């Protein structure tokens, strides 16, 4: 979904276009002409809001570049099957109705007054004859990502925007599961995203393996599809393609053959179905936090695979040629056990933080050894071993197996950048299980961070002993105004339990408009509610009273959708019934493992001498002016002095304080920041005689 949305983006910035600063705020708003051409919901949340959008589902671009949309013309009050594509001007010279308008089966408008959208964004009633054009689908104004949010018509615009944006951050889990309730866009989005291999021609499958599949076409020609597995994606995730067909099975042309990432039988599936209970619980789900059952961790429901990628190269130098070798200067053999004869880690070897990944030795010039270093070299018999150590090592906070190694050599006639002879890249695969700090989110823009992961015996459980898989606080639902969340919960429970609408006396009044095939559903069925046209409130109210009983012969939820839970700790039933149901939960890519940073002492910048470095030694956290004002308000003068002198810029103060801490003595007095000496030298360079003077006026030296 993320790639498909990226391809259909409409960016208004960049070369030849406006800039963030110069662009006014008036261009970032919606216009009545965006209806059907540019989605008014899907948009970045950050500063690039209103400058980036997406084509609507049915939009087609004109040869001249103007976006068009389909409209089926109504000639004399009878809607026509044939459609015509109108650009903005043609639309603004005509009277365009709405798809929801009640229409007779013969194309006759039942209502004399049909809601109409006309020039300038005006919306008002018109006689059913003046109307000229009518929309094709109620989903014509929404993008592809926004078209797969069930009950979008009940969510607020900002909540819908947040949900649509968060749907594109979901991480593909090890085992994918299609939603119980989801719009009809899932399958088409999956098919057109291109991440599922689809049979090009109709045929019969000869043999299917985990790697490939061969299908014999009816014309006698066989074709083999190679399915990439555990291949790193652009953002570190893994892309697997598991065949979903069996040998000797006839496949029709255009039928899906294997499921890529985030797919369950050829339909988009970004998350799993979890049993949700909506209530506050001991304050562990306080203010958007989320409580999870340990059963999700132990069952690998939300387990994900991430693949890191590291690479080192041996480039020729003036002093000599760098080489990769198993031999390294002065390292114990145990640390080098995992490497192979060629000097690179053996495949399948667990590699930990800071471990050596590929051993290379760089040429050395001339540098007299320090007294004790040279003396020890002489004593131990170890020669100087001038060649230095520059072996690639696992950065800080990395682990996992070594799934694959790829080595390119100039000797084997491989195209490498000039001055490079050997380049090797090692792929490290890590399996992440959900933990505290990770982000989860439903399709309705209700994020959250895992506050706690309770044992399966502490979770509230239904009357039949089934613990709830996740708990969501009820104070964030009505304030944020995304009731579609609760509607989805109710419909998900109805789908999971299965229903049987009574019809012996006749179809009930609330079920008159239900499809004839929707009066019964087996347990764990699949249902869909298209955006802006789906299950009405009466439909859900009727279905909640017709759900099938469990295998035990008892109905858990009431007609209101609430059930009587039991306290997992006290063991006594909760005083009042609680809302329960199955909700679709996704795992966002804002994992805690990436966020955690820590620094005590590491590399320092060169020009500014301030703290700085890579992920091996995380850089320091900026202490801005607002933080300085906050410190000044307290009256804390020494804390600010330290934060700005003794641990930021004092070249000698840093060494002195590190000496003091590692020893028993006290922390010394801070000196003068380098950021002030630098300022004075820079200001003197402009021929400005700048000198600090005491009360006497005598110049002081710095």
């Amino acid at each position: 979904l993320s790639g498909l949305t990226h391809k259909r983006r409409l960016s208004a910035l960049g070369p030849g276009g406006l800039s963030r600063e110069r662009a006014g705020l008036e261009v970032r708003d919606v216009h009545p002409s965006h209806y059907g051409r540019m989605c008014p919901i899907e948009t970045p949340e950050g500063p690039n809001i209103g400058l980036i959008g997406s084509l609507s589902v049915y939009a087609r671009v004109n040869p001249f570049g103007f976006i068009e949309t389909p409209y089926r013309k109504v000639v004399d009050g009878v809607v026509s099957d044939e459609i015509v594509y109108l650009t903005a001007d043609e639309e603004d010279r005509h009277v365009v109705a709405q798809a929801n308008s009640p229409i007779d089966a013969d194309g006759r408008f039942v209502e004399p007054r049909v809601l109409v959208r006309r020039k300038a964004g005006e919306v008002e009633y018109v006689p059913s004859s003046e109307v000229d054009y009518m929309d094709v689908s109620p989903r014509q104004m929404v993008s592809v990502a926004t078209a797969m949010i069930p009950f979008l018509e009940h969510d607020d615009a900002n909540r819908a925007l947040m949900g649509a944006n968060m749907q594109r951050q979901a991480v593909p889990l090890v085992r994918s599961e299609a939603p119980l309730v989801g719009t009809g866009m899932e399958l088409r989005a999956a098919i057109d995203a291109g991440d599922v291999v689809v049979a090009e021609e109709s045929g019969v499958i000869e043999e299917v393996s985990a790697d490939y599949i061969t299908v014999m076409h009816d014309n006698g020609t066989r074709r083999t599809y190679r399915m990439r597995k555990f291949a790193r994606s652009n953002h570190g995730t893994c892309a697997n393609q598991c065949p979903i067909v069996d040998a000797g099975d006839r496949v029709e042309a255009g039928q899906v053959i294997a499921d890529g990432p985030c797919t369950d039988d050829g339909e988009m599936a970004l998350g799993k179905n979890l049993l949700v209970a909506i209530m506050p619980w001991e304050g562990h789900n306080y203010e958007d936090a989320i409580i999870l059952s340990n059963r999700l961790v132990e069952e690998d429901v939300l387990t994900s695979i991430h693949i890191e990628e590291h690479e080192i190269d041996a480039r020729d130098t003036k002093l000599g040629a760098e080489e990769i070798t198993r031999d390294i200067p002065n390292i114990s053999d145990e640390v080098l056990a995992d490497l192979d004869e060629r000097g690179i880690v053996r495949i399948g070897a667990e590699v930990r933080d800071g471990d050596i990944l590929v051993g290379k030795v760089t040429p050395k010039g001339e540098t007299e050894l320090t007294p004790e270093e040279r003396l020890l070299r002489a004593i131990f018999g170890e020669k100087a071993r001038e060649v230095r150590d520059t072996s690639l090592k696992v950065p800080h906070g990395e682990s996992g197996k070594v799934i694959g190694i790829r080595v390119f050599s100039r000797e084997d006639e491989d195209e490498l950048p000039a001055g490079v002879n050997e380049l090797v890249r090692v792929y490290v695969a890590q399996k992440r299980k959900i933990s505290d700090g990770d982000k989860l989110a439903g399709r309705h823009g209700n994020k959250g961070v895992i506050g706690k992961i309770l044992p399966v015996e502490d979770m509230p459980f239904l009357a039949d002993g089934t613990p709830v898989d996740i708990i969501l606080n009820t104070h964030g639902v009505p304030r944020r105004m995304n009731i579609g969340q609760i509607l989805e919960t109710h419909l998900g429970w109805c789908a999971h339990s299965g229903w049987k609408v009574d019809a012996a006396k006749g179809v009930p009044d609330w079920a008159a408009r239900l499809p004839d095939e929707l009066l019964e559903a087996q347990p764990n069925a699949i249902v869909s509610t298209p955006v802006f046209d789906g299950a009405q409130e009466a439909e859900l109210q009727g279905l909640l009273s017709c759900t099938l009983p469990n295998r035990d012969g008892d109905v858990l939820v009431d007609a209101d959708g609430k059930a009587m839970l039991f306290d997992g700790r006290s063991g006594e039933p909760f005083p009042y019934p609680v809302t329960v149901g199955y909700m679709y939960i996704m795992k966002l890519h804002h994992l805690v493992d990436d966020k955690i940073h820590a620094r005590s002492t590491g590399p320092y910048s060169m020009i500014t001498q301030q703290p700085l470095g890579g992920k091996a030694q995380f850089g320091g956290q900026r202490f801005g002016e607002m933080e300085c004002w906050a410190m000044q308000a307290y009256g804390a003068a020494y804390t600010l002095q330290e934060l700005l002198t003794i641990k930021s810029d004092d070249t000698v103060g840093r060494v002195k304080v590190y000496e003091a801490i590692v020893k028993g003595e006290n922390i010394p007095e801070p000196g003068i920041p380098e950021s002030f000496k630098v300022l004075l030298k820079e200001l003197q360079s402009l021929c400005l005689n700048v000198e600090v003077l005491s009360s006497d006026g005598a110049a002081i030296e710095l």
Binding site: V57, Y58, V136, E252, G266, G534
Partner: peptide, 25 residues
């Protein structure tokens, strides 16, 4: 009305028929 041959069957609360199928995304 699954356009693709082997789609999973998920009934829908669709009270309106769409005269045009979604084009290539």
């Amino acid at each position: 009305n699954n356009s693709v041959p082997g789609a999973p069957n998920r009934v829908s609360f669709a009270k309106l028929r769409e005269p045009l199928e979604v084009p290539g995304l």
